[PDB]
Structure 1
Amino acid sequence: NNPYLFRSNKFLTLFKNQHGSLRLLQRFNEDTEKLENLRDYRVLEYCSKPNTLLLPHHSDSDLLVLVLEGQAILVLVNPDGRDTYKLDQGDAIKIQAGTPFYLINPDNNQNLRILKFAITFRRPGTVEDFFLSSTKRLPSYLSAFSKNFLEASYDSPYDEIEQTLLQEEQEGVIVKMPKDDKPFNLRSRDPIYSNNYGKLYEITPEKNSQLRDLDILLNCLQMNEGALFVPHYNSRATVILVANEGRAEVELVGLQLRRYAATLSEGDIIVIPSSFPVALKAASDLNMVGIGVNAENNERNFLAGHKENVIRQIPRQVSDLTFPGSGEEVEELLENQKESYFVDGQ
């Protein structure tokens, strides 16, 4: 029915216990041919309660992690040392494939909600995580090496090894903290569109190094109840829109001619293909996050509103031949709307 809509019920549970959970969105091109260009990306969601730890592991994919709610302490381990980063809501950072890391929710009363965008390359569309410790689910990967191999490697009898490293200590991979380059924020720059109905912050590869290698753009959208983000479309970027807070009424048009409309609730996701005109209304105060792939050189073209409206650049004789009304009639209509980008949805 509507191939660009991914409701939260379409995420799959990798792990869940009383301290948090890890879910993975179904493959973008799982049951549609329309999203072939997104086959190398996977979206994950990590949520954990206070004073919890996600145990050390490395992923086989490059990850872009965004703190959607809360605060976290992220530790990146290298062969020669380690890097510790304190993440705030709205903070983003790229964890390269193969870097072991663990995450901590240090807050005493706030939950951690993190969005992980995965860019796969080893096996297109597949993300694997290698955890160092054994648990109910799965034994430590170190455990699959032969005794001989292990004994020689560490230079200790198998005994010391299976007791100090391989034995199952914890139950899951999210555990309770024993009861005793750099990240960037999506709001570190003025918004690009900002008025009394809405605000849009956006970081593009041309301005940020970590995004430059991924060819990804990131954006933070906030709108007031009843406001409307007017019909527009992206020239190059296909955008994965994530509903963070609030409810949104989204209308997407694509090519015979189809209208895909839906109301997104927190957790829901809608993918906006490059070139498709789209518009959305804040059915309530809302915040959304957007990840745009194929981002280099994207341009947003507006179809309504005063500023950046392409329809307003079409000359009169052309517009006369283009639309029903006369040149003067169309040019006036396009003037009625005084506001740009975000308008009143009343």
Structure 2
Amino acid sequence: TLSSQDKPFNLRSRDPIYSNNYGKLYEITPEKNSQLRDLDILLNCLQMNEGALFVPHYNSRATVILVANEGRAEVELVGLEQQQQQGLESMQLRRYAATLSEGDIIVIPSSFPVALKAASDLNMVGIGVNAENNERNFLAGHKENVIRQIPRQVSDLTFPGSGEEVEELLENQKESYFVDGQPR
């Protein structure tokens, strides 16, 4: 990496977008890097400890492919299948769970909620396609929780309980993105 700098000169890291304890995530986007900028990819590095659930989320635009560099992962993907189907209830609700592992690849469509589990100490690379514009919305955790935004009156109407009862259930988890997977 030479001082005659300027090309398709190589790239690597910056402050993770989600560091923590339980785990971290670094992520080069297209809007902040030119060799991908015109490539439309998002690249991202995901590191976690024995047992740190990446908590339910879904990317808005990007479709991310993930490879297991190092470790053992338990992925749990969630779905509604093909609209060459034409019937609401007549659809599917599927859960795709795989314990991936050094070698394997998981494809992760753009709105389908995902959650991971770091069975071993994990190193994962993310090659996101359909980048420009992606947002990650969370359904659990303390920062960027979205179940935490539906106003009160609506929550009552929406979830099997109530306004006040959602708002609790919700912050009964003072942690961010990667949290404790410790079962019972």
Pairwise TM-score range, normalised by the shorter structure: 0.7 to 0.9
Change (3 A) 1:204 1:324: same
Change (3 A) 1:268 1:315: same
- Aligned residue for 2:53, secondary structure, equals strand
CA RMSD of aligned residues (A): 4.5
Q: Once the 2 structures are TM-superposed, how far is the Cα of residue 192 of structure 1 from its aligned partner? A: 0.3
- Aligned partner of 1:213 in structure 2 is 38
Change (3 A) 1:344 1:320: same
Change (3 A) 1:180 1:316: closer
- Aligned partner of 1:286 in structure 2 is 122
What percent of counterpart residues are identical? 96
TM-score (norm. length: structure 2): 0.87
Question: Is 1:188 paired with 2:24?
Answer: no
1:222 to 34, 47, 50: 47
Q: Which consecutive segments of 4 or more residues in structure 1 shift more than 3 A?
A: 177-187
Q: Once the 2 structures are TM-superposed, how far is the Cα of residue 187 of structure 1 from its aligned partner? A: 4.9
Figure out how many residues of one structure are paired with residues of the other and give that number.
Answer: 170
Q: State the alpha-carbon separation in 1 of the partners of residues 10 and 52 from structure 2.
A: 25
Q: Once the 2 structures are TM-superposed, how far is the Cα of residue 186 of structure 1 from its aligned partner? A: 6.5
- Counterpart contact for 1:186–1:201, Cα < 8 Å: no
Alpha-carbon deviations, 1:148-201, whole Å to 9, x = none?
xxxxxxxxxxxxxxxxxxxxxxxxxxxxx9999556777521000000111000
Any gaps of 5 or more consecutive residues in structure 2? 79-89
Change (3 A) 1:290 1:319: same
Any gaps of 5 or more consecutive residues in structure 1? 1-176
Q: State the alpha-carbon separation in 2 of the partners of residues 255 and 238 from structure 1.
A: 22
Q: State the alpha-carbon separation in 2 of the partners of residues 244 and 214 from structure 1.
A: 23
Q: Once the 2 structures are TM-superposed, how far is the Cα of residue 205 of structure 1 from its aligned partner? A: 0.6
Change (3 A) 1:255 1:197: farther
- Counterpart contact for 2:54–2:115, Cα < 8 Å: yes
Q: Greater relative contact order (Cα 8 A, min sep 6): structure 1 or 2?
A: 2
- Counterpart contact for 2:49–2:118, Cα < 8 Å: yes
- Counterpart contact for 1:187–1:201, Cα < 8 Å: no
Alpha-carbon deviations, 1:285-332, whole Å to 9, x = none?
000000000100100000000000111011010000001111001110
Please state which structure has a larger fraction of its residues in helix.
1
- Aligned residue for 2:54, secondary structure, equals strand
Please state which structure has a larger fraction of its residues in strand.
1
Change (3 A) 1:311 1:256: same
- Counterpart contact for 2:8–2:35, Cα < 8 Å: no
Structure of greater Rg = 1
Q: State the alpha-carbon separation in 2 of the partners of residues 225 and 231 from structure 1.
A: 18
- Aligned partner of 1:239 in structure 2 is 64
TM-score (norm. length: structure 1): 0.47
Q: State the alpha-carbon separation in 1 of the partners of residues 126 and 31 from structure 2.
A: 17
- Aligned residue for 2:155, secondary structure, equals helix
